[PDB]
Homo-oligomer: A and B are copies of this chain.
Amino acid sequence: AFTVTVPKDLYVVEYGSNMTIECKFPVEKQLDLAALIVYWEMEDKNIIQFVHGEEDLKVQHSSYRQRARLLKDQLSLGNAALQITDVKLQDAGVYRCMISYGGADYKRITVKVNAPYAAALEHHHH
Q: Which A residues fall within an 8 A CB radius of B?
A: 1, 37, 39, 44, 51, 98, 100, 103-104, 106, 108
Closest 5 CB pairs of A and B: A100-B104, A100-B100, A37-B104, A104-B104, A44-B108
Q: Oligomeric state, in number of copies?
A: 2
Q: Which residues of B contact A103 (CB under 8 A)?
A: 37, 51
Q: How far is the CA of A16 from the CA of B1 in the complex (A)?
A: 36
* Centre residue among A39, A51, A100, A103 by max chain B CB count within 10 A: A100
Give the one of A1, A51, A103, A104 with max B CB within 10 A.
A104
| Contact B44 A104, beta carbon cutoff 8 Å | no
Beta-carbon nearest neighbor of A99 in chain B? B104
